[PDB]
Structures are given as structure tokens and as C-alpha cells.
Design a protein around this ligand. Structure first.
Ligand SMILES: [Zn+2]
Ligand SMILES: [Zn+2]
Ligand SMILES: [Zn+2]
Lengths: 65, 1101, 48
RNA sequence: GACCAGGCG
DNA sequence: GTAATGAACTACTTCCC
DNA sequence: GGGAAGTAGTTACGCCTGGTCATTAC
């Protein structure tokens, strides 16, 4: 649905740095350099951002009251 | 040149333009445009017993989808409204009736004959052509492909039956005799007739006809159709001198013994034995007219053509005997045709209309006879209008579509749609089933066939007895519709083919067949087939026409019917493919589409017949002068779910089958509108993710927008026993942070029904006085209107809706409590409450319950490579080992499970996933085109790790490193919906069956397990007699019976005076008591129901 | 017994009594489907 | 309660 | 308002010209 | 009589899910 707050394996907080990564990778930058700049060294954390889908935005159209 | 990466661009446009459910929508559109008119025109009109009256049928029309309220008004309807209110999504039908009075037609009138269900997203549905935001505003998911019906609020889908060819002639040979049997099926107006002609040891040809038990001889049945002269028979069948000698041997049984009417006498004697002499002639003529090859017509004039066809079949039979033709293969796909929605619906509409016309005839006759002619002729329009009952059509169509029992004995035509997730629904919409019986082995039918390449997925199939008999379409498969045949025949007649009547076939001349029937001969078919196919390539004729030839028998086949399964290919001429780089560029920009590529002649469709003459090359760099076609994309031969497995060519076939079947059960975000959608069951994964290693097909088909599953950090290590025998170990802290978390839904329904008279139900909090009043604790959170407040916790047996039924007649003045309650073994929170009105005025409420489920022991986890298991132990984080680079495993799998299954693809995927996560870019693993292993290993070596994929870990308890490097990577994993919370069950005492007083059956109604017969045999083998007595009798039905010792009958005990006596014999002192199971008393009673008398002899002790 | 209800597709409040009302319809929309709104009570949920 | 369809070992 | 129904197998048993 | 030929009888064990029934003309 929405970006997880913490990496599952090691608990590092990565929930606040998804939008910056998406924007800088849509701006034509090298994804590896962007991930290195953001400070994610262990690949257990890179796996979280590299493979996420924002499915929240296309389910708010249906309201249940 | 053209590289395999360029053909992918062309292949994408096929799915981008056509879709995935074409075989339903196209067939239904064809049925709508033409099927109804043909069915109506078949009947012609109504012929009542009125002296001067007759009605002629006109045109037929389909209106807009609408619903009629019980008070009279008619208003538009939308699919979600139909789903919620448990209605039927249908549209009305209109028909024009032309009255004929004294042989003069009057002005036409129009009446409504009923309602017809509408396929979703068809050419007449309200959702056709709408934009994405329009669908969003209407509550529909834009990803929904459509192609299913809505019957009584439930979703039905029609599967495709894999029938046999409709008019071909197939020859074979059995070993129990020397019979050379050639059998055909003949279809006319939905009637199937089986006709066989064969020889035996006598050497005389015999014919079998329906309703004719005796196999009448061949010459006898030929002379019944005319052409009695012996020259005519031989001229009709063949001209080979050996065939001439065989026919001269055959004639002597009937050449100089019978004439045309004498054979009619023989047939009449057989069909009507011992009946009236005049009756026999009419019966035989009727049987000959409408039971012998009905597809050639039923008029008596067509008997010469019928004789010609029978002679051709006999010629094939005798040609098998001399070994001039190999026996046909039944499993070859050129002999099989599919049945789609447009033909099954045609048959159903035919039978319903046949009922309706008879009902109308009866009503008109009765009304005229009762009221008199003056009333009928006073207002003819009103007389016709008010004599139609438009329910016999609608109810009969709807019930057949709902239950799934088709007329004609067929079963399972319509099935419930599987809505677990995206892949399940998409795969269910592309099923193919066989009409054979499941129990029998059917060794020949279940095997794979060479012609299945590109038309049937070779790996996706069920696992139980249904293996082989249920299959799924491939991705390149394309089903065909039908074009009119008269135009094709008159076109074929215009390029040199002479008619069969004018010229007799001879061995030097080619034969030409059209849809299985013979139409003429030509002097050279090799040029004719080239001319026809070149005309098709140019664009003169339709692309549904396929032409093939066999030079062994000198025959040419032309097919134009529907039901064939075809695949596209690239035309190759002079050793050079016709597809160029500029064509790929034009397709990529958007100027060119797939249909234009088909029209220009670059790409053509081939069925199973044309592929006999083809010689297809596999790769673009393997073509030469001999080749005639080029394969588009070999990776597309797999089905839809079987294409999810990365690197599918590195695994064993059973593991691929298990993975493909198991991919339809994983949890994930199914559809965007799950909140509004009302379903009996549902699931939702909290944090779905996209696989790191994936095939490029899944991006194209839209799987990435509705994923299911997450990526785990997996270490292949043997732990302390708790992960042995396909068991897995999961981290606890990972679970606490949201890994593999899911929610479960369930919907309950209640109705305020109306009874006969003023009696009715009511929504109300029950009073303590009413019968069956539960404890007042259960009616805890019900509002005074009788409905539960949303977002309130509920336990088992809690009441959701309070309802009080009218009193049951023997209890007077006492309402009955019939409230709807949560299932006794469930728990959750109320999510939403909906109030609405049904189709006949009654109220209706639907309540959903939401329950949160966290992984625990017993839950089933499974990857996509066919590895499955259950959670064995949950481990705290500090006890798990950690790699020296700072990685803690998320999952542990036993190394003993790898070598036996030989799933190297899992290791390949682990390496690729780790590399992809390190590099920040996803890895392509599309079948035979994906990135090779050595490249991944070299990249992993470059990134700093070791090429073998191993690392160094430290023990989580002792604190020192292990002696061996440990394989570790990232692997996609899925959570199946077989949770342990839905399987636990225990019974001590509960309800029992009424008839046998034994415990009930089923988890849902507190049933008990069954102690089968082999369990009794095992108990006997151990020798525990008292255990058998306790298990089989004490814990089951047990009773005491009074037995009369003198006569052996069962005595009678009276409660009115506490006296026991035998009814049959006056004995009152020898009565004794016996302890026996109730089921045996029922058996004794059932034996005494028949005239059998069992007598019991007692004994002491 | 008067209770509040909300239209399925418009969202605007509809006020009627289910005991005697013979047809269910939003006075604003042709729809016959209605919701039952949540009560105003401080529901308590664990954070595990 | 009996049928039909689909799954699990 | 109700009374009224509308595919393989194997071993026996019967022929039978 | 001993060759058809036509009956007649069978075809693993549990468990789970859901859906439909159980007449009608006057
Ligand atoms: Zn991490
Ligand atoms: Zn007695
Ligand atoms: Zn409204």
C-alpha cells in the first residue's frame, strides 16, 4: 500500500527517503550512485526501496463511509 | 539484420491491441449479430388450429440492459448494482410477429419475448468504450478484462469444450476383429448422429444407422436412395480396377436380388417389426430422410448426394484394407474443434425458443376455442399480445446458466469465477476442458502431443485425476470465428474446379474438400494451393481460410469454420524473412499496428493443417533456403501462470508444474475495489512487492500493477532439526516489522422474507419471551433497529442481525428466533453494513467481518520454483546467525531438499536477486533470452563478493564462526491461503443425523471424523477387540431393544401402562433385552421392508 | 426509532425509519443502496 | 439431506 | 388454489447352423 | 457341438471450499 517505515531485516528507518530516490532516478541519475548517496549500504535495505509499488493512490477512489 | 530483441517489440503489439479474453467477446458478438436471427428463421412461424390463422416471424432485436421494479417502472442498471442487490444483469428481447389472415399478410406487431443475460464488456454492455476515469466513477477496476455473466448476484464463466470435428471422416482399426471402421458425426440444428460403415471377415460392407439395430448391407442401403443399376454403384464409389473387383465381389449379395422398393420393404421390416404393412414404409422413409447423414439435408431429393457421400466413406474403408491410407490419429489437433460461448448459448436459446413456440400455440388455440372467433378477430393485435407468457424463456435460460447443467446431458459448462487474485482469474478465463470421463485411465488422451506446440501450455495442468484432461491455452493462441460458406464455395468454383456430379474421380485426378465434404476434382492442386495462399497473402480473401494438401492420396483441404486454434508466424521467402528493421521502427513509433502487419502479408496464421506443409526455423540466424517460416518468440509457448517462473528451463518438469499450479493460490492485492466489492471470502497482503528477478512478459501483461509476494533474505543452512523434511524457520523480528502480514474477509447475508399471507419476518431485538432466545450477552451491540454498529469487536456465536420468524404451527403466539450469527470458530471486527432492497420488495442486509492474521506455526509458505513447506519454529533475532558483512537471514531452508528436486533455477534466482539488489536495477530472466549465469557470477565478483555466492557467518549462540562458508541470497516467496486457523477442529458431543443418529459431517456444523474400513482392519491386525468395541459402538449410536425369545421378532414396549409384550405372538414372559447399534436396527427394519424375514436366536451370557 | 443513513454513491445523509418505510431510496439519487454510518465512540486498538 | 464444480495429502 | 405426473476390462448365459 | 454374441459386474482413502434445489393450470 504505502512505503514501509523500517527495513524488515535490520530495522533501519528508510520510510522517509523513498520519494527523493524516485525523483532522482526519474531525473536520469545513476540508481547505484543515488542509493550510495542516501546512505543505504547493506543490500537488505536497498531491496526495500528498489522493489516497492505505491498502491495507495489508486484505492482511495473507493470510499466506504 | 533482425535480433531476437527486436521481435519482442512486434510481439508486444499483439497483446496491446487484441487482449487476452478475445475468444469470449468475439464469439458472443458473433452470436448477438447473427445467431438469434438464424435460430428464429429456422422455425418459420406458428401454425395453430384456428381455421384461417397463421403467424410469420420477422426480425429480432436486443434492448438496453435494464431492470423492472415490482411497482412497474423500468430503470437503467449497472454491474455493481446488480452484484450488490443479487440481481441478474440482462437485457430484454423483442420480436416482430406478422399476422396472416386468409393468406394475406397484415401490418406487423412487436412483442417482448423475454430477457437475455449480457456478457460483461461486450458490444452491448453499458461499459463498452468507456474511459478509465469513467470506470473509476462507476466502481469498476480498470484492469478488469470482462467476459463473464452476472446471474443472481454471482459471477459465472463458460469454459470451452474440446469436441471432435463436426463433419470429418475418421478411419481406424480394432484388434478384436479385422473391422476397418470409419465413423462420422453429423450435425444439423444441434442434433448429433453417428454413422459407421465397415467391413469384416465376410468381406461385405455393412452400415450402421441410429435407430436401426441391424447393420443393413451397403448395397441395400444404396439402392434405397435410388440408382439401382449395378453400374451406378460402381460409378458412384470409385474407378480403380482392384476396387472394381472388390465391388463385383460385393454386389452379388444384392445385385440380382433386390430393387429400390424391396430394400425399402426390408428396412421397414427391420425398423417396424410386426407392425402394420403401410406403417413400415413411412417409418423407413422417415428414418432414411432424417437419420442418415442429416448434414446433407432431410429433403428426399438429397438422396443421391447422400449415396455419393456414403460411397466415398466406403471407398475410404476399402482403401484402408489394401493399405493405401494410414489410419487416422484421434489426438492430432487437426481433428478437434473447440466450443465457445456463442454456440452453447445458441443451443440453449434454440431449446428455450422451441418450448416457447409450443406454449404460445397452446395458449392461442385454447383462447380461440373458449372465447370464440368474434373476440379473436375483434382486436387481433391484442389477441396476439396477451397470449404470450415471457417467463418460459427467461427462467429456462437463467436456471441452465446458474446450475451449470446444459441440455443434452452435459455437465459443468458454467463454473464460478475464481477471484483469489489477478493470476487466478486471468487463468480461469482461458480454460480448455475435455468431455471424457475422469475415472478411466485414458492413457492415449492424457499424453502430450506434438501439435500442442504453440496452442496448449505444456506445464500448467491439475495434479489429481484431472491431469491431462484439463489444459490451458498458450499465449500465442488465437481462436477463429466463421465466415459464410456459400461465398467461399462460389469463389472456389470459379478457378477451374469441376463439380463432382459432372465428372467422376479417378486416381490421376486430385480431390478437393471444403469443410470435410467433397466438392469436385482438379488436374493440378499444387498450383491451386499456391494460388489460394498467395491470394490470401495479397488480401483478396479473409485470413481465416487455411489450405493444405497431401500428395499421397492426391487431396486438397480447405477450412473456413470456427473453433480452430492457430498461431502466428513470419513469412519467409527465398531464405529471407519478410520483416525488416524499418517495420520494427514503424511499429515502435506507433504508425503501424498488428492488424496492418497481418493485412500487408508479413505475418500469417497457421492451424494444425497448414503446419504439415511448413518447415519452421527457430532462430533468426538459422534460416536457409529450405525454410518457409520463422518463429516469432519461443518463450511465448508457455501459458500465463507458467510464465511467472524465472529461468524455467533449468528445472525439472514436475517442479515447474507444481510452481505454475501453486502460483494461483498466493495472497496479494487482487483488485483495487475490494473495499466496496461484496464477496463470500477475500484476502489482502499488507505490503506487496515486485519481484527482483522477473520475466519481461509479466510487465506487458500487467502483473506488476497487482503483485503478490515479497522478497526474503534466504540462507541455505541446516538448523537444529526444526527445519527438517521441508520445514522452514522464520525470524521473529521480521514478523514483528510487518513481513507476510495479511487480513481475512467474510460476508454474511440476511433477508426479511415474505410468507404466504400476512405472515412475515421482522428486524428487531428479540424479547426474552420468544422461543429459542439466546443469552442476553449475545445481543450486546445491536442497535434498536436490529443492526450491529460498525467497527465493533465480535467473538464466536455473536449475533450480527436480529430476526424473529413467525410462529411454527404445531407454540401459538410465540415468535421464533432465527438471527444471523458469526460462525462458532471465527473472530474479527465488523467492517461495513449495507442496507438495500431485493428484486421483489424484500429488505436485504449484508455484513462483512475483518480479521487480522499474523504468521504462526503451521502456515504454508512456498516459492515459485515448486518448493513448499510450513513454518516449524519462530526464532528471536539475537539467536540467528549473521554474515560478517552485516546481513541476518530472514529465512532458513534445509540443504537436503535441493539435490532430490534438482531445482537449479532457485539458486540462479538467488544469485540474480542479490546482484540486482546490489546494482540497483532489476534482472531480466525471460526464459531462453534472459541474462546468462556466467555474466551474473562475473558481475557479483566485480561488486566485491565471491563468485560462488558463499559468505562467512558467525554462530548466534556460541558466538564463533562456522567451519563452512554458507550460501545466501535473495529469493521471492509467496504465502498461500491454506492457513492453520481454518483447519483446527475438535468435537466431544454435538448434533447427530436424524436418520441414523450418528454424528454430523463437516467442520462447519460441528461434525466428527470418519473411522473408515481400513482403520477397522488395522485395529483387527493389532488385535485390540475392546478398542474396536469402544470406538465403533460406544462412541457411536447405541440402543437397547426388547426381543421376543419365542418367535424372534422385536417386542413392543408401551409407556401408557409400562407393559411389554410381543405383537405378532402372544408372549409376555420370554421378553429379553439386547444391546446393539442403532444402524443395525435400521438395517433389520429395511430388510423387513422387503419380504425378507430375519429371525433372531438369543443366547446366554 | 429514527436512524441516520448515507447514500451509497452520493454520500449525503438520508434520514428514515426502516420499520415502516416501504421503499429505500435516497431522495437525492435514484440509488437504493445505503450505508450505516460509524458511531461516535472512542474505539481502542492495540498497537501490536 | 441429496446433487454439481473446484482444491489439499 | 390444489389436484394433478410427466470406457474399458473380466467371466457367464444364450444361442446356433 | 464348441464357435459366436449378448448380458452382467467392478474400477483407493480421507478432508476443505462454494452454489442449487424441493411442479403448476386455472
Ligand atoms: Zn536493512
Ligand atoms: Zn413373539
Ligand atoms: Zn444519494
Amino acid at each position: 500500500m504505502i512505503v514501509p517505515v523500517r527495513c524488515f531485516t535490520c530495522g533501519k528507518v528508510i520510510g522517509d527517503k523513498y520519494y527523493e530516490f524516485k525523483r532522482r532516478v526519474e531525473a536520469g541519475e545513476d540508481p547505484e550512485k543515488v542509493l550510495d548517496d542516501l546512505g543505504l549500504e547493506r543490500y537488505c535495505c536497498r531491496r526495500m526501496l528498489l522493489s516497492h509499488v505505491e498502491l495507495i493512490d489508486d484505492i482511495m477512489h473507493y470510499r466506504v463511509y | 539484420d533482425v535480433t531476437p530483441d527486436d521481435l519482442w517489440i512486434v510481439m508486444e503489439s499483439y497483446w496491446q491491441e487484441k487482449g487476452l479474453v478475445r475468444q469470449h467477446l468475439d464469439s458472443y458478438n458473433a452470436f448477438i449479430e447473427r445467431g438469434l436471427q438464424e435460430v428464429v428463421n429456422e422455425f418459420g412461424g406458428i401454425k395453430p388450429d384456428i381455421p384461417d390463422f397463421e403467424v410469420k416471424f420477422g426480425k429480432i432485436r436486443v434492448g438496453e440492459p435494464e431492470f423492472q421494479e415490482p411497482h412497474g417502472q423500468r430503470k437503467p442498471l449497472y454491474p455493481m448494482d446488480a452484484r450488490i442487490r443479487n440481481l441478474t444483469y440482462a437485457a430484454p428481447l423483442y420480436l416482430e410477429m406478422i399476422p396472416v389472415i386468409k393468406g394475406v399478410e397484415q401490418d406487423p406487431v412487436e412483442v417482448r419475448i423475454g430477457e437475455l443475460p449480457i456478457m460483461l464488456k461486450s458490444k452491448v454492455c453499458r461499459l463498452y468504450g468507456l474511459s478509465d476515469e469513467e470506470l473509476i466513477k462507476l466502481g469498476e477496476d480498470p484492469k478488469d478484462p470482462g467476459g463473464y455473466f452476472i446471474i443472481n448476484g454471482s459471477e459465472r464463466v463458460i469454459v470451452s469444450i474440446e469436441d471432435i470435428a463436426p463433419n470429418r471422416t475418421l478411419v481406424e482399426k480394432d484388434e478384436r476383429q479385422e473391422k476397418y471402421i470409419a465413423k462420422v458425426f453429423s450435425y444439423r440444428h444441434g442434433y448429433r448422429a453417428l454413422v459407421a460403415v465397415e467391413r469384416r471377415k465376410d468381406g461385405i460392407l455393412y452400415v450402421d444407422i441410429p435407430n436401426v439395430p441391424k447393420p443393413v448391407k451397403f448395397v441395400y442401403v444404396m439402392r434405397a436412395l435410388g440408382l439401382e443399376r449395378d453400374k451406378d454403384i460402381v460409378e458412384a464409389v470409385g474407378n480403380d480396377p482392384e476396387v472394381q473387383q472388390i465391388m463385383f465381389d460385393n454386389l452379388e449379395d444384392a445385385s440380382d436380388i433386390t430393387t429400390q422398393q424391396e430394400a425399402l420393404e426390408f428396412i421397414g421390416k427391420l425398423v417396424a417389426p410386426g407392425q402394420a404393412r403401410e406403417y413400415r414404409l413411412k417409418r423407413a422413409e422417415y428414418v432414411i430422410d432424417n437419420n442418415l447423414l442429416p448434414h446433407m439435408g432431410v429433403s428426399p431429393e438429397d438422396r443421391i448426394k447422400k449415396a455419393y457421400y456414403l460411397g466415398m466413406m466406403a471407398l475410404k474403408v476399402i482403401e484402408l484394407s489394401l493399405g493405401r491410407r494410414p489410419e487416422d490419429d484421434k489426438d492430432h489437433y487437426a481433428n478437434k474443434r473447440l466450443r465457445l460461448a456463442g454456440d452453447l448459448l445458441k443451443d440453449l436459446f434454440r431449446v428455450a425458443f422451441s418450448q416457447l413456440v409450443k406454449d404460445i400455440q397452446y395458449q392461442m388455440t385454447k383462447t380461440y376455442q373458449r372465447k370464440g372467433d368474434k373476440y379473436t378477430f375483434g382486436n387481433i393485435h391484442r389477441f396476439i399480445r396477451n397470449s404470450i407468457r415471457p417467463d418460459v424463456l427467461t427462467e429456462r435460460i437463467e436456471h441452465a446458466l446458474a446450475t451449470g447443467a446444459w441440455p443434452g446431458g452435459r455437465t459443468g459448462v458454467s463454473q464460478l469465477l475464481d477471484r483469489t487474485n489477478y493470476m487466478s482469474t486471468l487463468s480461469h478465463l482461458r480454460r480448455v476442458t475435455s468431455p471424457l470421463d475422469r475415472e478411466q485411465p485414458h492413457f492415449e488422451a492424457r499424453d502430450l502431443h506434438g501439435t500442442h506446440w504453440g496452442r496448449i501450455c505444456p506445464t500448467e495442468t491439475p495434479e489429481g485425476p484431472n491431469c491431462g484432461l484439463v489444459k490451458n491455452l498458450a499465449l500465442m493462441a488465437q481462436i477463429t470465428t466463421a465466415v459464410p460458406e456459400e461465398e467461399i464455395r462460389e469463389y472456389l468454383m470459379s478457378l477451374g474446379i469441376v463439380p463432382i456430379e459432372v465428372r467422376r474421380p479417378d486416381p490421376t485426378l486430385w480431390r478437393v474438400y471444403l469443410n470435410g465434404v467433397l466438392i469436385g476434382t482438379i488436374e493440378d492442386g499444387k498450383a491451386l494451393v499456391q494460388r489460394i495462399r498467395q491470394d490470401r497473402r495479397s488480401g483478396k480473401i479473409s485470413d481465416v481460410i487455411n489450405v493444405a494438401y497431401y500428395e499421397d492420396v492426391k487431396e486438397v483441404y480447405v477450412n473456413s469454420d470456427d473453433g480452430r486454434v492457430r498461431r502466428p508466424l513470419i513469412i519467409v521467402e527465398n531464405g529471407v524473412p519478410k520483416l525488416t528493421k524499418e517495420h520494427v521502427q514503424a511499429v515502435k513509433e506507433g504508425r503501424l499496428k498488428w492488424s496492418d502487419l497481418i493485412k500487408m502479408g508479413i505475418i500469417e496464421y497457421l492451424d494444425a493443417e497448414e503446419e504439415e506443409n511448413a518447415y519452421v526455423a527457430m532462430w533468426p540466424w538459422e534460416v536457409t533456403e529450405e525454410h518457409t517460416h520463422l518463429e516469432l518468440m519461443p518463450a511465448a509457448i508457455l501459458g500465463l501462470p507458467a510464465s511467472l517462473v524465472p529461468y524455467p528451463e533449468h528445472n525439472a518438469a514436475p517442479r515447474n508444474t507444481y510452481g505454475a499450479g501453486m502460483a494461483k493460490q498466493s495472497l496479494g492485492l487482487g483488485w483495487a475495489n475490494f473495499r466496496i466489492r461484496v464477496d463470500t471470502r477475500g484476502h489482502l497482503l499488507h505490503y506487496p512487492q515486485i519481484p527482483l528477478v522477473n520475466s519481461r512478459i509479466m510487465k506487458a501483461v500487467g502483473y506488476e500493477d497487482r503483485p503478490a509476494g515479497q522478497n526474503f533474505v534466504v540462507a541455505v543452512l541446516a538448523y537444529q532439526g526444526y527445519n527438517m523434511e521441508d520445514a522452514i524457520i522464520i525470524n521473529k523480528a521480521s514478523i514483528e516489522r510487518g513481513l507476510a502480514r495479511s487480513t481475512f474477509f467474510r460476508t454474511y447475508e440476511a433477508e426479511e422474507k415474505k410468507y404466504l399471507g400476512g405472515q412475515t419476518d421482522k428486524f428487531e431485538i428479540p424479547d426474552p419471551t420468544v422461543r429459542g432466545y439466546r443469552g442476553e450477552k449475545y445481543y450486546r451491540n445491536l442497535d434498536e433497529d436490529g443492526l450491529i454498529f460498525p467497527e465493533s469487536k465480535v467473538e464466536g456465536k455473536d449475533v450480527l442481525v436480529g430476526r424473529t420468524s413467525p410462529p411454527r404451527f404445531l407454540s401459538l403466539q410465540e415468535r421464533r428466533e432465527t438471527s444471523v450469527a458469526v460462525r462458532p470458530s471465527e473472530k474479527g471486527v465488523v467492517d461495513k453494513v449495507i442496507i438495500t432492497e431485493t428484486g421483489d420488495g424484500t429488505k436485504l442486509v449484508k455484513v462483512t467481518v475483518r480479521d487480522l492474521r499474523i504468521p504462526e506455526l503451521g502456515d504454508k509458505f512456498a516459492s515459485r520454483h515448486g518448493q513448499k513447506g510450513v513454518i516449524g519454529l519462530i526464532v528471536p533475532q539475537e539467536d540467528m546467525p549473521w554474515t560478517e558483512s552485516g546481513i541476518v537471514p530472514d529465512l532458513i531452508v534445509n540443504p537436503h531438499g535441493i539435490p532430490s528436486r534438482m531445482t537449479v533455477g532457485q539458486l540462479i534466482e538467488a544469485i540474480g536477486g542479490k546482484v540486482a539488489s546490489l546494482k540497483g536495477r532489476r534482472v531480466d530472466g525471460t526464459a531462453f533470452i534472459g541474462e546468462p549465469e556466467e555474466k551474473l557470477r562475473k558481475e557479483l565478483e566485480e561488486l566485491g563478493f565471491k563468485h560462488t555466492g558463499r559468505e562467512i557467518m558467525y554462530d548466534g549462540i556460541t558466538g564463533k564462526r562456522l567451519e563452512a562458508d554458507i550460501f545466501i541470497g535473495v529469493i521471492y516467496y509467496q504465502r498461500l491461503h491454506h492457513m492453520v486457523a481454518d483447519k483446527i477442529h475438535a468435537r466431544s458431543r454435538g448434533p447427530v443425523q436424524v436418520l441414523t443418529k450418528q454424528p454430523t459431517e463437516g467442520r462447519a456444523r460441528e461434525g466428527g471424523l470418519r473411522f473408515g474400513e481400513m482403520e477397522r482392519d488395522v485395529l483387527v491386525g493389532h488385535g485390540a477387540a475392546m478398542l474396536l468395541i469402544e470406538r465403533l459402538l460406544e462412541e457411536s449410536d447405541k440402543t437397547e431393544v426388547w426381543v421376543c425369545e419365542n418367535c424372534g421378532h422385536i417386542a413392543l414396549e408401551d409407556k401408557r401402562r409400562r407393559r411389554v409384550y410381543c405383537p405378532v405372538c402372544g408372549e409376555e414372559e420370554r421378553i429379553s433385552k439386547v444391546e446393539m447399534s442403532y444402524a443395525f436396527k435400521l438395517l433389520l427394519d429395511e430388510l423387513k421392508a422387503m419380504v425378507i424375514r430375519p429371525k433372531l436366536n438369543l443366547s446366554e451370557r | 426509532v429514527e436512524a441516520v443513513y448515507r447514500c451509497f454513491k452520493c454520500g449525503r445523509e438520508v434520514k428514515l425509519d426502516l420499520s415502516i418505510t416501504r421503499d429505500l431510496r435516497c431522495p437525492y439519487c435514484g440509488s437504493k443502496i445505503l450505508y450505516k454510518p460509524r458511531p461516535k465512540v472512542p474505539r481502542r486498538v492495540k498497537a501490536i
